[PDB]
Structure formats: structure tokens, C-alpha cells
Amino acid sequence: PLIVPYNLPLPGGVVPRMLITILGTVKPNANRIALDFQRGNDVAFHFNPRFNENNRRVIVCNTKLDNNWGREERQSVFPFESGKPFKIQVLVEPDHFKVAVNDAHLLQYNHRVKKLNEISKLGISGDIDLTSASYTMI
Numbered sequence: 001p002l003i004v005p006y007n008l009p010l011p012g013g014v015v016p017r018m019l020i021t022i023l024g025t026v027k028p029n030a031n032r033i034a035l036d037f038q039r040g041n042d043v044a045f046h047f048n049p050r051f052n053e054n055n056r057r058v059i060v061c062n063t064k065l066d067n068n069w070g071r072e073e074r075q076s077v078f079p080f081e082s083g084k085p086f087k088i089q090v091l092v093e094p095d096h097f098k099v100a101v102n103d104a105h106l107l108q109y110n111h112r113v114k115k116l117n118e119i120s121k122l123g124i125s126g127d128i129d130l131t132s133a134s135y136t137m138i
């Protein structure tokens with residue numbers, strides 16, 4: 001087990017064909033999870049499953065610049081289940097982050113923050129038991 005919130009350093013930032021893998025288990029009756037790919041205090045990519053927003057499950061993605069959230073991108077396809085082990089894979093591509101959960105494509109999120117090599121931290125928070133967070137090149 002890893003303690004949540006957890007910070008995974010991304011030395012020298014991210015780059016296309018870098019794959020970040022997060023393994024854990026959703027807590028029973030979870031409410032929220034977040035991944036925050038950070039450039040200093042800015043959040044280049046916030047990936048935020050919400051288990052009960054007006055009695056619906058939704059994935060909210062966004063960017064935070066100078067402490068201001070931007071336009072949300074929302075996905076109703078929701079692959080997480082309370083109590084179950086999950087794998088989130090975030091693949092950095094030239095124009096977007098691509099996310100797959102449990103080996104099924106979920107979403108893409110276009111790069112708003114363009115200094116990829118300065119996105120040097122991944123924060124992992126919320127209602128999970130975290131087992132592993134790592135990266136490799138494909």
C-alpha cells in the first residue's frame with residue numbers, strides 16, 4: 001500500500017510515448033478520485049471521477065492555471081466500480097493525453113499546457129487504496 005494523497009515525481013516532465021500506470025482499488029462507497037498532472041502549481045491535466053454528482057457518475061477533466069479552473073470536459077462512460085481493483089493508464093501523445101482504464105480506451109484530453117517537459121509531478125488523491133504508480137516508455 002501507498003499513502004494517499006501521493007506524489008509521483010515525473011523527472012524532466014512528460015514526453016510523447018511516456019505511459020503512466022496507476023494501480024489501486026476503489027474504496028467501497030467512494031465519492032471521488034483525482035489525478036493531477038502538475039506544472040508547478042498549475043494542473044496541466046486533472047482527471048476526476050465523481051461517483052455521485054446529482055446521482056450520476058461522471059468523469060470530469062480540466063486544467064488549472066494561476067489557481068483558476070478552465071472549461072470542463074465531461075465523459076459519462078464510467079469504468080470504475082466501488083470496491084474493485086483498477087488500472088489507469090495515461091499515455092502522453094503529441095497533441096493529447098490518452099486515458100485507458102482496465103485496458104479499455106476511455107478518453108483523450110488535448111494539451112492546454114504546452115511545456116510538457118515541465119509537467120514534473122503526478123498527484124493522486126481520493127477514495128482509493130493505492131498500490132502502484134510508475135511510468136515507462138512504449
Ligand SMILES: O=C(O)CO[C@@H]1[C@@H](n2cc(-c3cc(F)c(F)c(F)c3)nn2)[C@@H](O)[C@@H](CO)O[C@@H]1Sc1ccc(Cl)c(Cl)c1
Binds near residue numbers: 032060069125
Ligand atoms: O470545491 C469543490 O466543491 C469542487 O472542486 C472541484 C475541483 N476539485 C476537485 C478536487 C478533489 C480534491 C481531492 F482531494 C480529491 F480526492 C478529489 F477526488 C478531487 N479538488 N478540486 C475540480 O474537480 C474542478 C474541475 O473543474 O471542479 C470543481 S471546482 C469548479 C466548480 C465549478 C466549475 Cl464551473 C469549475 Cl470549472 C470548477
Ligand SMILES: [Cl-]
Binds near residue numbers: 032048050
Ligand atoms: Cl470532485
Ligand code: NA
Ligand atoms: Na527546468
